[PDB]
Design a binder for this molecule. Structure first.
Ligand SMILES: COc1ccc(N2C(=O)CCC[C@H]2c2nc3cc(-c4c(C)noc4C)ccc3n2[C@@H]2CCN(S(C)(=O)=O)C2)cc1F
Length: 121
């Protein structure tokens, strides 16, 4: 998650600072592939997905929000990234490939976001 630590940012400043962290997620192949589009429960034959997951998130949604300047503060981007991870950890079993891939992306994200957040203050 995001955590407070003891500033209005322009959308282009956010995009510049944060986009590399998203790019690092997309670069993980094959780990990012299940996360690049919204989960489609009809194609996947999982009618209970939206019972468990009330607030879906994925990389395409995050990218669109960054691209269109929807995040006002870096913590909002960080929250959406963790939402995506937490949803995947919640729904899928720990034995599954997609859960393991989720964990791998979260490790990459933690490593990349930390120095960025320090900079942005
Ligand atoms: C590249 O990594 C994967 C590639 C394929 C798979 N899958 C299988 O191994 C078994 C067949 C179904 C497939 C698959 N499972 C997915 C699960 C999710 C998902 C996530 C994330 N959070 O909750 C759920 C449920 C998402 C996609 C899954 N897929 C494939 C991978 C890409 N597609 S698609 C065509 O819908 O974009 C479906 C799992 C993977 F982790």
């Amino acid at each position: 998650g995001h955590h407070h630590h003891h500033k209005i940012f322009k959308p282009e400043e956010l995009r510049q600072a944060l986009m590399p962290t998203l790019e690092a997620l997309y670069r993980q192949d094959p780990e990012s592939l299940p996360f690049r589009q919204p989960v489609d429960p009809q194609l996947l034959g999982i009618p209970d997905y939206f019972d468990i997951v009330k607030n879906p998130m994925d990389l395409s949604t995050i990218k669109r929000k960054l691209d269109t300047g929807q995040y006002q503060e870096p913590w909002q981007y960080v929250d959406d990234v963790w939402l995506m991870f937490n949803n995947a950890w919640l729904y899928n079993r720990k034995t599954s490939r997609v859960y393991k891939f989720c964990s791998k992306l979260a490790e990459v994200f933690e490593q990349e976001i930390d120095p960025v957040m320090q900079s942005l203050g």
